[PDB]
Amino acid sequence: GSSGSSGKVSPPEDEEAKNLAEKLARFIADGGPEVETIALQNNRENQAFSFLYDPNSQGYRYYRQKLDEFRKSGPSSG
C-alpha cells in the first residue's frame, strides 16, 4: 500500500507488450481494487500477461507507470 516510481526506466522491446502493458493498466485503471484482482487472478492463467509479474522485464515497470498515470490518486512528487 504505497506509491512511487517515476519513468526513468526505458520501454520494453516487445511491441505487442508496450500495447498490452498500457492497455492492461488502461483497463485496470478504469476499474479499481476489483479489476486488479480479476484481471490479475485471471492474467495468472495467461502467460502473455507475464510482464505483470516478470520483474526483470522492463515492461512490468512501464506497465505500472501507466497504472499510476491513469489511476491518478496521490498528490505527491518529491
Swiss-Prot record:
Q: Where are the SURP motif repeats?
A: 20-63
For the modification Phosphoserine, the affected residues are 10
Task: Name where it's found.
Answer: Nucleus
Tell me the function of this protein. Plays a role in pre-mRNA splicing.
**Summary of subunit composition and partner proteins:** Component of the spliceosome.
**What's the protein called, per UniProt?**
SURP and G-patch domain-containing protein 1
